[PDB]
Amino acid sequence: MVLYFIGLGLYDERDITVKGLEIAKKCDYVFAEFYTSLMAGTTLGRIQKLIGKEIRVLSREDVELNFENIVLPLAKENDVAFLTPGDPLVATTHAELRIRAKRAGVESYVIHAPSIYSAVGITGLHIYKFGKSATVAYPEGNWFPTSYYDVIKENAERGLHTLLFLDIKAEKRMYMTANEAMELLLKVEDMKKGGVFTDDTLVVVLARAGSLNPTIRAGYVKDLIREDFGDPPHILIVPGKLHIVEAEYLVEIAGAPREILRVNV
Amino acid sequence: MVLYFIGLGLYDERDITVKGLEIAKKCDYVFAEFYTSLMAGTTLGRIQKLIGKEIRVLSREDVELNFENIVLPLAKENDVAFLTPGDPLVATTHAELRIRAKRAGVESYVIHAPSIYSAVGITGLHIYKFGKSATVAYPEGNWFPTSYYDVIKENAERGLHTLLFLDIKAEKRMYMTANEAMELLLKVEDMKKGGVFTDDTLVVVLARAGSLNPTIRAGYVKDLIREDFGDPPHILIVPGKLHIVEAEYLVEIAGAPREILRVNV
Ligand SMILES: Nc1ncnc2c1ncn2[C@@H]1O[C@H](CSCC[C@H](N)C(=O)O)[C@@H](O)[C@H]1O
């Protein structure tokens, strides 16, 4: 009679919270989805072993189209768990799932876990300074999306930082690297000439947040465009004007050029 | 020879991640601070019992003024942990402590946990649509803070949601309620008269996120300003232009007036 939306956190099977794990262990059925994001530091087998329960994986279609036919029926007579990477309900379409639960007479509870939205605080950039967020999508066929470029422009114009999620093909298991994001942004700049993203733009790359050994790098595009940030997932941030404390952290922790202490503050 | 910044999460001692718990268990020394936020669902005793170690609680002055004299010395020849409510680097000035750690020759690692910054997802408002965030500070003496008013204005103007952290005087055990935040805002509106926050403004209140039964309410100020949202901590949100599904969630889950379902554009 109860559905639990439980977040798995950032990188591996240990990013789930104690509360999350204990609740998942008491559930009769456990579902999971890995299309909003993957867990690069673990496997379904490791998550299953940790929880001590078989996990049924659901596709985007299973969820978006049949959530009430696959999950809710079981949540009517049993305790059911729905696992997702990061913090539940952060993914745009997930909140609506609670409406479906209510409509079906199912109670639902949300057990939080670390999210990239808060984990980016490890870059040293002040969280309050982040503006609207966006996703960099691969152009395709006759479709060349560029809204994320405008997001950066409006945020930076107000001295705000921009968090950029990079495209991911869940099933195809392929992620857009920070390097590819930069190349794409450089292309959009040549098309819009807005002076928003260029070789001299300062950027921060965060890779494998959640891991005990994440990659945090800050610098100008011209110098980071071909650098190796390691395995995915990657997240790209275009900061707005920096507070001196943000700058110092980037230099001392993210190996940024001392030059940002005079150019970007 | 190591310092761990470990977040404890939102409500109780079980909001810590498994990773954080296992690491905190193997640490030689454990320090903590409870002035940056409130964990309404637990106590120091329960936390100590969970990790199996005594915790030396530090004041804001101990940290900001003597972190390098109290904590870092031990991290030189031992494994030390520094516990914090929510996520260690979110809406705090703790990031700078890693610089101090570095200059002292101490390696540091960050263990994330659920943060209110991403927990706002439970309000049904798309997290990518949040703009710059702000903190509503208690006026003091003749000094009356008002910058948060301009943040709301700037965001609303762009159609973005505004997250408002509420003030806290840990030593006085005083935690600002959403009601108090609304009163202050109406007062700033009278002063500035920018038509940014009035009795007809739609707002969302989130109290005790992290508990299994948080209070989530949405409605016009004139109706919520005197409503009881339960014990602290509270967070206030002034949404911008709503998507149909955001409105639907606010009505179905946060008990908002069915009239907001009819967006105006
Ligand atoms: N569980 C909770 N429910 C509602 N508001 C909360 C909350 N926890 C924190 N807050 C809000 O966040 C403010 C503290 S700012 C520090 C945030 C913390 N580092 C984190 O990552 O969560 C509190 O004053 C309150 O306004």
User: Tell me: domain B115-265, CATH 3.10.129.10, correct?
Assistant: no
CA-closest candidate to residue A148, choices A237, A71, A24: A237
CA of A248 to the centre of ligand 1 (A): 26
Burial class (CB in 10 A: 0-12, 13-18, 19+), B185: buried
Which residues lie below 8 Å from residue B203, measured CB to CB, with a gap of 6+?
B178, B182, B218, B219, B220, B221, B224, B236, B237, B238, B239
Query: Which technique?
Result: X-ray
Each domain of chain A, given as residue ranges in start order, spans 2-114, 115-265
Q: Cβ separation of A121 and B87 shorter than 8 Å?
A: yes
CA-closest candidate to residue A223, choices A244, A246, A200, A242: A200
Range 166-205 of B in CB contact (< 8 A) with A = none
Q: B198: how many CB neighbours lie within 10 A of its CB?
A: 15
- How are the residues of chain B apportioned to helix, strand and coil, as percentages rounded to the nearest 5? 40, 25, 40
Q: Which phi and psi (to 5°) does residue A68 adopt? A: -75, -10
State both tokens at A109.
């509870």
B-chain residues near A47 (CB < 8 A): none
Q: Please, are residues B125 and B132 in contact by the beta-carbon 8 Å criterion?
A: no
| Secondary structure letter of residue A242 according to DSSP | P
Which residues lie below 8 Å from residue B84, measured CB to CB, with a gap of 6+?
B5, B6, B7, B8, B32, B33, B36, B92, B94
Q: Cβ separation of A115 and B110 shorter than 8 Å?
A: no
Topology adopted by domain A2-114: Cobalt-precorrin-4 Transmethylase; domain 1 (3.40.1010)
CA-closest candidate to residue B123, choices A16, A161, A88, A207: A88
CA-closest candidate to residue A84, choices A152, A20, A136: A20
Distance CA B63, CA A89 (A): 34
In three state form, how does the secondary structure of B10-58 look?
CCCHHHCEHHHHHHHHHCCEEEECCCCCCCCCCCHHHHHHHHCCCCEEC
Q: Cβ separation of A129 and B124 shorter than 8 Å?
A: no
Rg, Å, chain B Cα set: 20
- What's the longest Cα–Cα distance across chain A? 63
CA distances from B122 to A98, B76, B80, B215 (A): 9, 41, 34, 10
Is residue B137 helix, strand or coil? coil
Residue matched to tokens 């530091």: A41
Distance CA A16, CA A83 (A): 10
